[PDB]
Amino acid sequence: MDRPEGSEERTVQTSNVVLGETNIESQDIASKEYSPTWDRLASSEVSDEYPMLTDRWLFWKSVKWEVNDSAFGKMLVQEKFPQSWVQMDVNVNNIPRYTNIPNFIPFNIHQYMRADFEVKIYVNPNDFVSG
Amino acid sequence: MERTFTPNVMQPTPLLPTTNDGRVTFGEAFNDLKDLARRYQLYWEGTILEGNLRAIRRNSALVQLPLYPHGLRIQPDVNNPIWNIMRDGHIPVISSGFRYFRGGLRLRIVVEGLNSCVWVQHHPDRPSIFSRPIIGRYIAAKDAYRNHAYAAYVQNMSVNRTIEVEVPFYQPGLYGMLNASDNNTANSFDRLRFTGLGDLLIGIEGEQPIPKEGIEISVYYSIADDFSFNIFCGFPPMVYCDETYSAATPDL
Amino acid sequence: DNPPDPTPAKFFVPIPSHSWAHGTNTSEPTNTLRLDGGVVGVGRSDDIGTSDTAISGIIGVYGLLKPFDWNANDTGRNVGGHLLWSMPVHPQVDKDQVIQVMTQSKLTQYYLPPISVVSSLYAYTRGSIKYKFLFGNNPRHNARLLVAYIPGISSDNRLTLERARNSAHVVFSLNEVSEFVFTVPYITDTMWWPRKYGGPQAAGEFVAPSYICMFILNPLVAMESVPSIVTIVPMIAAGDDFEVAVPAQPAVGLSRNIDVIYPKDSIISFKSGYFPVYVGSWHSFFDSTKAILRYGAVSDHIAQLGNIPANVNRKAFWIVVGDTIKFKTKLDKINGTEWFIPEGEYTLGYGVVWRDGAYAYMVPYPLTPLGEKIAQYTASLLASNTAISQIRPYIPDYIVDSAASKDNILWSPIEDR
Amino acid sequence: DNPPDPTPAKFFVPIPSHSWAHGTNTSEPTNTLRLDGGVVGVGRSDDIGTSDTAISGIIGVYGLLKPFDWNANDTGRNVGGHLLWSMPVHPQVDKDQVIQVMTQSKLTQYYLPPISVVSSLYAYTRGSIKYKFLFGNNPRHNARLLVAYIPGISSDNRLTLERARNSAHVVFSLNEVSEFVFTVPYITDTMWWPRKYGGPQAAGEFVAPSYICMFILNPLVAMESVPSIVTIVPMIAAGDDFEVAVPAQPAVGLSRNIDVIYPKDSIISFKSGYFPVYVGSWHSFFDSTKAILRYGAVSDHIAQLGNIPANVNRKAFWIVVGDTIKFKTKLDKINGTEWFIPEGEYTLGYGVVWRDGAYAYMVPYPLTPLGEKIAQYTASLLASNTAISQIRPYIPDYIVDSAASKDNILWSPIEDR
């Protein structure tokens, strides 16, 4: 910290959401990136796209891990993807609904769907821990 | 990219000069697992007696064989010494590191002890949801008898006791699943039609009796030319073959 | 017109099948089960990649090895010259440097890295290996390590820091750095090196050519407001110069089915009337301070083993096959090693045969990776007729009589490096 | 001159026959039974066309589906929002939407359209389907219909007009128009779709991907000098984008011989002395208002079934194989369905097993397509342990004792979707 403001925070914008980061990332890609061609052979109905809704960085879970429950191989998250994320808005009976989250609103009126995904993991520790 | 991420390298010596994957010292190269998967290995082998077949054997099937690129679920027992100490072949070991595939398989059926004729059919729209074969009188009628219009091959043992066929990929989707579970109820559809190439049925066509020793059917398999191991996920944990039969008794 | 064709017949040799071994650089005649009788191949698109079986792309992926803790407050170990971590260098990792899962009566599951899995498919191997070291530190921690590659050495029996510095080595500083890679050389008297682990009954096995060792140059320092332990996670991948020669029986099998049928001819047990058995003590064996298997509480009632075949190696220890028992034992740390068994209840997994004249007795060992090592070492000491007083510290202690077995207990012969 | 020919012999592999599967894009060696030993083929002219086996030209021909009446005077049904007609969309038509001919002890004959016949020869299918609707009207009749294509739905369980409008649909006006075509889309999560009907024992069968439904927007109007009923005849053909993937066991067989031998191992009957049987009533079964099979007029003389094998599915109903009987029954219209049996004399074709302790009884059903459906539904209700009071409306009523059988009656297990 050497400025009146703390220092410069990098910014990443998508749709109407802006994420701030301050450090150098760790990155990877599950498989080779590509543009699909055989999806057009599956449905004669025109495939709708809602980029301002879907290309939006959305907040998922927060999971709290403590020193007393942190062992080698401890699973902070084990979730079916993207099922668990798209179905994260449940009712009193733990039944999911696609009706409230704008990113998921197209899932309610369509039977079949496809997309590529990106997942960010944010941890904000102090200067004096290790893990 | 993290999987291959190598920061702050500290290398005391230069690299080791190449041999082109063995081509310099031996006459051939070894750079692709796909090449090894094209070397045949045992898929399944068993002995069949008259008692395993239907009382009245109306040219009925001998073996109902599910076709998986990653092979069958092995059963190590006193009667199967190979699976017990050799365990799974190279192809199931190779397959375990990949999620999907899209090609065909090449088979080789070796039938010994039978003087009759053997028929072989491929049922691409009827693949099994279990990783084990079905034998003789336990095979349902729908499969126990020759079906029409399926790709087939009929071979007299008098001319040759080895059958060579290539099984094609006839699946409605993009990929076929490798390493699929038999315990699958949440995704039955995936397990039913997006996993196996379809059952291969091996039957007998003649009235000749089976010898008291029975007939032996040995099915070898390998990857076809149009086959691809597609998405590299992790390898699963392994067992060591030298931990089956110990070297404490070096000869046994 | 019906002209005769008196062209001489050719000699041909009939064979039942085409090549079984060939997998590349050749055609294969076959009966394709298709409607199209030409050279046919399944369709493709970008939705479906090409085969990702190129070896270099597989073995380049890092795999995790057995992690270890690095305690800054250990005034005994955290000193200059101390050996933190060491092992032979070869593509398959040593079994005891890999994450394991053991199952009673079944096979052990090993979490082998990609370079280890692929190498077990081939007979020979060569090239540099990338050892990535990941440290669980923060900007307060500091140290300096010396990691070395010792050609032609397989163990740390003569290994010291002041010798390790006389081989190819690197010196790493942990000053606000958490990852670094030590790409070790390939120094051999030959061009290809035989794999270490092979097949059943150690078929075609051999040894590693070199050793890697991590020494403490400048000991780890922390502060009071910061964790005093720094975990180190070793990882392994193939260097850009790595190659694999020759297809052989896989050294490995899948873990979908970890069942195994040990040879019935090697199985040994207790004589009739000498079972059920329990873990206990008796006076003529280190004044009844060590654990042995008894069949009763009257003394000189120590379970006797049945006939032990002569084809069983003298340096071999044993593993329980069928049902077993639990027992409470302990073992104090042995001088010059990190070998100790804390006082706890353990299942009986291993045994070592103690001979007294025409009678053979069995000594119990815990079903644990360290118990496997101590059992093996003890069997070796009995093999060289080591002093009875010097084998004493390698034997589990007697605490209290344990439960008895349902019936007889069956054992199978095994042996390690 | 007699020069030696030391040319090395070649390796060849003997096989008894040429390809059995190949039907195109290859030559086939064979022994032609002709006098001319060359490549010979029968002569032709314009008198003899070329083969008309091009699939697209076959499946483009419309086939007739089960017609239905559309009554303008039905103040109950002829209202906005009413579902007139609906079924799953797939190339083979649903069996209950096709003209049928049943034969006692034989197989049913189905009048399948060309697109249905061809599709039963192949494993996969895809593309648009043309549904032509023909109306028996004249310029007085008027209405508006809403026909919809619902992707991912197989039944009308959650189907209403006010939901159907939220999928691909068309709105047709019957104003001096008698024919129109609804070319429905192909909306799937995959590229090929497995056929619905396969082989014996439902070999390789699956389900349809989508649903088509016809709703009443503006109800049918007629006048007093004009027929109040308008028949609707649905027809089906393949769209220009239709394709068929993979040869498999035909789902169909010819109707030249409709004989069939049901498996002897599945056959069940009545215990000795418990036949001949007749249809009647008894008190402990809905106060003797429903039909069951008795063996005498003394009470608690209800025909008992022999041993029923455990491999028989619990939701399965039964079909009579040998000789049978005629009986007079009826069933009143069931709420929420168009299910009713008018009072008439019917042959006994189907049965459902009613269990009471260690005794098993058989409930009679008429040999009629609707009787097949009601029998199946009842067997399913017994399977889920449905309330005895709620299964009551699905059981044929008792009117009067019927003739007895010549001897025992044999039954075979069957099951529908």
Side-chain angles (χ1 to χ4, degrees):
Chain A
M1 288 184 56
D2 58 329
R3 310 167 161 73
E5 81 267 40
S7 43
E8 295 311 301
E9 184 160 315
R10 188 173 68 261
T11 196
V12 171
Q13 190 173 335
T14 182
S15 188
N16 62 349
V17 174
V18 179
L19 301 182
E21 317 193 332
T22 64
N23 293 331
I24 295 176
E25 294 193 325
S26 169
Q27 326 196 79
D28 202 341
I29 317 183
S31 57
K32 198 173 186 302
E33 298 188 302
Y34 67 104
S35 65
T37 173
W38 276 11
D39 56 321
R40 298 178 174 282
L41 307 179
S43 172
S44 65
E45 196 185 67
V46 186
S47 296
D48 293 340
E49 308 188 11
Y50 313 97
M52 294 299 282
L53 296 184
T54 61
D55 213 319
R56 210 170 80 102
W57 272 118
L58 189 59
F59 163 66
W60 197 163
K61 257 177 182 79
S62 281
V63 171
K64 161 183 174 181
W65 72 311
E66 313 167 300
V67 179
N68 51 71
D69 189 24
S70 163
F72 183 69
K74 154 73 178 181
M75 298 191 291
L76 305 184
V77 171
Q78 172 184 223
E79 300 293 319
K80 299 175 177 177
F81 195 84
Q83 176 188 105
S84 306
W85 173 58
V86 186
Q87 306 187 332
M88 76 174 147
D89 180 16
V90 300
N91 64 2
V92 62
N93 302 326
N94 290 309
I95 301 295
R97 47 195 179 178
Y98 302 144
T99 64
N100 287 335
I101 300 176
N103 308 27
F104 304 154
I105 209 66
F107 290 78
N108 202 25
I109 58 174
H110 286 97
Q111 211 76 286
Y112 311 113
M113 163 276 178
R114 184 173 61 88
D116 298 326
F117 308 73
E118 292 187 45
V119 182
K120 278 180 176 297
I121 176 172
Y122 288 163
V123 178
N124 293 266
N126 59 31
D127 197 77
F128 284 74
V129 286
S130 70
Chain B
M1 298 304 97
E2 193 67 29
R3 270 174 295 172
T4 60
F5 184 55
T6 116
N8 294 314
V9 189
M10 299 183 82
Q11 194 174 314
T13 84
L15 292 179
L16 183 70
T18 179
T19 63
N20 291 327
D21 310 310
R23 186 155 247 143
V24 167
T25 58
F26 323 105
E28 46 192 310
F30 306 85
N31 44 42
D32 206 311
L33 297 178
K34 197 169 57 179
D35 298 322
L36 181 50
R38 274 161 184 160
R39 166 175 286 181
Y40 285 100
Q41 84 163 65
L42 193 60
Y43 188 79
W44 174 87
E45 184 179 68
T47 299
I48 299 182
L49 313 167
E50 288 275 47
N52 300 133
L53 309 184
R54 293 155 182 262
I56 309 179
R57 179 193 84 198
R58 306 197 176 78
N59 291 327
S60 54
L62 294 162
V63 188
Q64 197 191 322
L65 198 66
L67 294 177
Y68 302 107
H70 54 281
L72 301 165
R73 179 198 170 86
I74 63 169
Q75 54 167 53
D77 54 50
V78 296
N79 305 294
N80 298 112
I82 289 180
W83 308 118
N84 189 43
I85 62 180
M86 316 308 182
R87 290 275 142 54
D88 317 275
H90 49 289
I91 306 180
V93 170
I94 295 175
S95 307
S96 72
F98 301 94
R99 192 61 191 85
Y100 305 108
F101 81 95
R102 196 200 179 73
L105 297 177
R106 282 178 194 169
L107 305 173
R108 281 189 183 176
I109 301 93
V110 180
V111 189
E112 277 298 341
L114 183 60
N115 297 80
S116 184
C117 178
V118 176
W119 58 265
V120 178
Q121 294 200 327
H122 172 223
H123 300 173
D125 71 319
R126 304 181 204 168
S128 178
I129 63 173
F130 302 109
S131 302
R132 213 55 209 156
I134 302 179
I135 307 299
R137 62 189 177 83
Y138 288 118
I139 304 174
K142 61 189 173 186
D143 293 311
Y145 306 106
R146 291 157 291 166
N147 292 243
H148 297 306
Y150 277 122
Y153 190 81
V154 183
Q155 183 167 314
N156 309 96
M157 296 294 96
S158 62
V159 177
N160 195 327
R161 277 169 152 76
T162 299
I163 309 172
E164 293 188 45
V165 295
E166 181 172 307
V167 171
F169 180 97
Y170 289 151
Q171 272 180 32
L174 298 177
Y175 289 122
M177 299 197 311
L178 287 178
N179 319 296
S181 171
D182 289 347
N183 299 337
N184 197 330
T185 52
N187 296 284
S188 305
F189 187 29
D190 295 17
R191 185 62 182 80
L192 173 62
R193 194 71 75 104
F194 297 84
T195 296
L197 271 58
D199 298 328
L200 182 94
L201 281 104
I202 303 170
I204 178 178
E205 195 183 294
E207 307 306 310
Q208 294 101 319
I210 295 182
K212 57 179 181 179
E213 308 80 29
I215 63 179
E216 178 149 65
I217 298 176
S218 304
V219 181
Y220 292 82
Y221 88 122
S222 72
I223 259 57
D225 193 48
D226 69 332
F227 189 100
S228 67
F229 291 106
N230 271 112
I231 301 305
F232 180 77
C233 53
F235 280 115
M238 305 285 179
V239 294
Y240 268 106
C241 293
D242 60 23
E243 275 173 33
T244 68
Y245 278 22
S246 179
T249 53
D251 317 304
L252 204 294
Chain C
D1 71 291
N2 213 5
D5 185 7
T7 300
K10 299 176 181 299
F11 276 135
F12 273 19
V13 176
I15 53 179
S17 63
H18 294 90
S19 181
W20 297 72
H22 297 167
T24 187
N25 195 43
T26 183
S27 299
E28 166 162 27
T30 182
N31 301 273
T32 60
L33 302 176
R34 309 190 99 110
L35 196 57
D36 194 312
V39 178
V40 182
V42 69
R44 279 196 158 72
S45 71
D46 289 315
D47 301 279
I48 308 153
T50 56
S51 189
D52 282 285
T53 43
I55 291 184
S56 64
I58 304 295
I59 58 179
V61 180
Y62 283 96
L64 178 143
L65 297 189
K66 193 184 75 172
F68 61 96
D69 292 325
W70 181 189
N71 181 19
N73 288 334
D74 193 321
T75 59
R77 298 183 180 76
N78 178 32
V79 300
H82 179 79
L83 182 66
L84 279 178
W85 170 91
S86 66
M87 55 179 219
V89 182
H90 67 293
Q92 311 161 307
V93 189
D94 267 3
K95 294 179 181 178
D96 55 79
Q97 286 301 325
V98 167
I99 301 302
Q100 287 173 34
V101 171
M102 310 186 106
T103 308
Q104 161 59 260
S105 173
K106 310 287 186 184
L107 302 135
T108 304
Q109 304 167 85
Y110 298 85
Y111 287 78
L112 310 178
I115 183 182
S116 182
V117 176
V118 175
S119 295
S120 292
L121 299 179
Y122 293 98
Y124 301 101
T125 186
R126 68 173 219 127
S128 304
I129 295 177
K130 296 192 292 187
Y131 284 110
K132 178 162 60 174
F133 294 100
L134 182 143
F135 297 79
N137 63 322
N138 65 46
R140 311 291 153 259
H141 305 97
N142 209 346
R144 251 195 175 82
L145 301 170
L146 184 149
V147 195
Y149 174 104
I150 322 296
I153 297 296
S154 292
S155 67
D156 59 315
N157 284 127
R158 305 178 56 79
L159 206 54
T160 67
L161 163 63
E162 323 181 315
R163 283 176 177 169
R165 66 184 171 185
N166 297 327
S167 297
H169 70 265
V170 298
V171 175
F172 169 71
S173 183
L174 189 70
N175 176 47
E176 297 170 350
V177 182
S178 298
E179 297 188 62
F180 86 100
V181 180
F182 178 21
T183 300
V184 298
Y186 174 90
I187 308 175
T188 303
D189 62 335
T190 186
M191 332 163 54
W192 292 98
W193 193 260
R195 61 181 184 177
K196 182 172 179 180
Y197 303 123
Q201 304 177 313
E205 300 207 326
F206 198 61
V207 296
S210 304
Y211 207 73
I212 183 176
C213 52
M214 176 184 283
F215 284 100
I216 299 171
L217 210 66
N218 284 344
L220 177 66
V221 290
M223 65 155 304
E224 67 258 38
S225 305
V226 142
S228 63
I229 298 176
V230 168
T231 304
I232 298 179
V233 180
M235 294 181 257
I236 182 178
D240 288 40
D241 59 350
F242 201 87
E243 295 177 315
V244 280
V246 171
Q249 158 65 44
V252 298
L254 300 184
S255 51
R256 183 185 191 183
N257 192 342
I258 62 180
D259 294 352
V260 57
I261 295 301
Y262 300 107
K264 61 171 185 177
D265 285 27
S266 297
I267 298 294
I268 70 168
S269 55
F270 299 108
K271 298 185 174 183
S272 54
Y274 291 91
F275 60 100
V277 298
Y278 67 86
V279 186
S281 65
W282 83 306
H283 54 284
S284 300
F285 191 79
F286 302 113
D287 303 320
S288 65
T289 195
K290 297 296 179 176
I292 317 183
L293 295 178
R294 304 181 122 271
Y295 73 100
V298 183
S299 205
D300 307 19
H301 270 209
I302 313 298
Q304 308 178 9
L305 290 168
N307 185 70
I308 292 182
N311 73 318
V312 173
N313 217 312
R314 185 177 173 75
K315 311 170 61 179
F317 65 112
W318 304 77
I319 184 177
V320 178
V321 180
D323 294 316
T324 185
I325 55 181
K326 284 182 169 61
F327 74 121
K328 283 186 175 62
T329 185
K330 72 165 186 178
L331 184 60
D332 295 314
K333 183 180 176 302
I334 309 173
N335 301 287
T337 50
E338 297 297 322
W339 284 4
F340 70 101
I341 303 180
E343 177 179 302
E345 185 175 299
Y346 297 112
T347 63
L348 173 63
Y350 303 107
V352 176
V353 171
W354 185 280
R355 293 175 184 280
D356 189 53
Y359 303 84
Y361 309 136
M362 186 68 85
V363 179
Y365 284 81
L367 186 59
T368 169
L370 184 56
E372 166 181 43
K373 282 189 175 184
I374 302 175
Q376 171 63 77
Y377 196 81
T378 301
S380 298
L381 291 178
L382 292 173
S384 58
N385 301 89
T386 310
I388 183 179
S389 60
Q390 290 178 48
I391 309 177
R392 193 179 185 285
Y394 297 94
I395 308 179
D397 302 318
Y398 167 65
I399 297 180
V400 64
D401 295 355
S402 63
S405 49
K406 298 207 311 171
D407 204 50
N408 201 357
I409 296 181
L410 304 175
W411 311 74
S412 187
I414 56 179
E415 179 168 20
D416 290 325
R417 307 304 189 85
Chain D
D1 71 290
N2 213 5
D5 185 7
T7 300
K10 299 176 181 299
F11 276 135
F12 273 19
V13 176
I15 53 179
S17 63
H18 294 90
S19 181
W20 297 72
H22 297 167
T24 187
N25 195 43
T26 183
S27 299
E28 166 162 27
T30 182
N31 301 273
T32 60
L33 302 176
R34 309 190 99 110
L35 196 56
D36 194 312
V39 178
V40 182
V42 69
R44 279 196 158 72
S45 71
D46 289 315
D47 301 279
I48 308 153
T50 56
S51 189
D52 282 285
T53 43
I55 291 184
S56 64
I58 304 295
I59 58 179
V61 180
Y62 283 96
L64 178 143
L65 297 189
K66 193 184 75 172
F68 61 96
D69 292 325
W70 181 189
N71 181 19
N73 288 334
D74 193 321
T75 59
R77 298 183 180 76
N78 178 32
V79 300
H82 179 79
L83 182 66
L84 279 178
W85 170 90
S86 66
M87 55 179 219
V89 182
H90 67 293
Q92 311 161 307
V93 189
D94 267 3
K95 294 179 181 178
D96 55 79
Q97 286 301 325
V98 167
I99 301 302
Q100 287 173 34
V101 171
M102 310 186 106
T103 308
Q104 161 59 260
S105 173
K106 310 287 186 184
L107 302 135
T108 304
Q109 304 167 85
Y110 298 85
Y111 287 78
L112 310 178
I115 183 182
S116 182
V117 176
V118 175
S119 295
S120 292
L121 299 179
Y122 293 98
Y124 301 101
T125 186
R126 68 173 219 127
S128 304
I129 295 177
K130 296 192 292 187
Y131 284 110
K132 178 162 60 174
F133 294 100
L134 182 143
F135 297 79
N137 63 322
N138 65 46
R140 311 291 153 259
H141 305 97
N142 209 346
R144 251 195 175 82
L145 301 170
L146 184 150
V147 195
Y149 174 104
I150 322 296
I153 297 296
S154 292
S155 67
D156 59 315
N157 284 127
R158 305 178 56 79
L159 206 54
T160 67
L161 163 63
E162 323 181 315
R163 283 176 177 169
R165 66 184 171 185
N166 297 327
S167 297
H169 70 265
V170 298
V171 175
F172 169 71
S173 183
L174 189 70
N175 176 47
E176 297 170 350
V177 182
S178 298
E179 297 188 62
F180 86 100
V181 180
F182 178 21
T183 300
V184 298
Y186 174 90
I187 308 175
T188 303
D189 62 335
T190 186
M191 332 163 54
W192 292 98
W193 193 260
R195 61 181 184 177
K196 182 172 179 180
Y197 303 123
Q201 304 177 313
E205 300 207 326
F206 198 61
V207 296
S210 304
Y211 207 73
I212 183 176
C213 52
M214 176 184 283
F215 284 100
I216 299 171
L217 210 66
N218 284 344
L220 177 66
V221 290
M223 65 155 304
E224 67 258 38
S225 305
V226 142
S228 63
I229 298 176
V230 168
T231 304
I232 298 179
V233 180
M235 294 181 257
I236 182 178
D240 288 40
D241 59 349
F242 201 87
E243 295 177 315
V244 280
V246 171
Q249 158 65 44
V252 298
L254 300 184
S255 51
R256 183 185 191 183
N257 192 342
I258 62 180
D259 294 352
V260 57
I261 295 301
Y262 300 107
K264 61 171 185 177
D265 285 27
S266 297
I267 298 294
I268 70 168
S269 55
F270 299 108
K271 298 185 174 183
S272 54
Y274 291 91
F275 60 100
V277 298
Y278 67 86
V279 186
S281 65
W282 83 306
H283 54 284
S284 300
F285 191 79
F286 302 113
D287 303 320
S288 65
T289 195
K290 297 296 179 176
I292 317 183
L293 295 178
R294 304 181 122 271
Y295 73 100
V298 183
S299 205
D300 307 19
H301 270 209
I302 313 298
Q304 308 178 9
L305 290 168
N307 185 70
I308 292 182
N311 73 318
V312 173
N313 217 312
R314 185 177 173 75
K315 311 170 61 179
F317 65 112
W318 304 77
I319 184 177
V320 178
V321 180
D323 294 316
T324 185
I325 55 181
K326 284 182 169 61
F327 74 121
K328 283 186 175 62
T329 185
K330 72 165 186 178
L331 184 60
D332 295 314
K333 183 180 176 302
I334 309 173
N335 301 287
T337 50
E338 297 297 322
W339 284 4
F340 70 101
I341 303 180
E343 177 179 302
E345 185 175 299
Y346 297 112
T347 63
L348 173 63
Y350 303 107
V352 176
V353 171
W354 185 280
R355 293 175 184 280
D356 189 53
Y359 303 84
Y361 309 136
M362 186 68 85
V363 179
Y365 284 81
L367 186 59
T368 169
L370 184 56
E372 166 181 43
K373 282 189 175 184
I374 302 175
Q376 171 63 77
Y377 196 81
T378 301
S380 298
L381 291 178
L382 292 173
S384 58
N385 301 89
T386 310
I388 183 179
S389 60
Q390 290 178 48
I391 309 177
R392 193 179 185 285
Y394 297 94
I395 308 179
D397 302 318
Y398 167 65
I399 297 180
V400 64
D401 295 355
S402 63
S405 49
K406 298 207 311 171
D407 204 50
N408 201 357
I409 296 181
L410 304 175
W411 311 74
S412 187
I414 56 179
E415 179 168 20
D416 290 325
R417 307 304 189 85

